[PDB]
Amino acid sequence: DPMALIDQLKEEQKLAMKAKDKLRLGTIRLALAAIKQREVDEQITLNDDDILAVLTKMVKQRRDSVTQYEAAGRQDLADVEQAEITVLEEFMPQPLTEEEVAALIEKAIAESGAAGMQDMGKVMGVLKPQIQGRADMGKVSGLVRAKL
């Protein structure tokens, strides 16, 4: 039952403001503005996975700015962008460990009653939402194929 990402971002905004941590505050504010943009423009309420997509795009855009700054010799500016990325990445999940993936697979097999390679789709359909972008699906496939 982790705190919703929207609430983690708002709490971190309040703390960064009280800390007078200027760069951190500014980047959190931009994440919250990107969330508001989607909720107004798409007429939806974002969940955690939606917010993770918001953060992933912000990290991508800043990573492309790092590329441009570093190609121009402006490491000082690329470092500011890296500091922004580090703030954003605080809210992102860690990749699943090998042992974590193996456990998800064994749980997916137990609950789906999977037996044999014909049940590859049955298992992967259970796993795919649970794995998100936290593991290589091809490797997960191969681990599942082994057990089946």
HEC states along the chain? CCCCHHHHHHHHHHHHHHHCCHHHHHHHHHHHHHHHHHHHHHCCCCCHHHHHHHHHHHHHHHHHHHHHHHHCCCHHHHHHHHHHHHHHHCCCCCCCCHHHHHHHHHHHHHHHCCCCHHHHHHHHHHHHHHHCCCCCHHHHHHHHHHHC
Site track 1-40 with Zn ion (rule: CB under 5 A), x = hit: ----------------------------------------
For Zn ion, which is the closer residue by CB, 93 or 121? 93
For Zn ion, which is the closer residue by CB, 18 or 110? 18
Number of residues binding to Zn ion, judged by CB under 5 A: 2
| Of residues 77-106, those binding Zn ion (CB under 5 A) | 81, 84
Interaction site with Zn ion (CB under 5 A): 81, 84
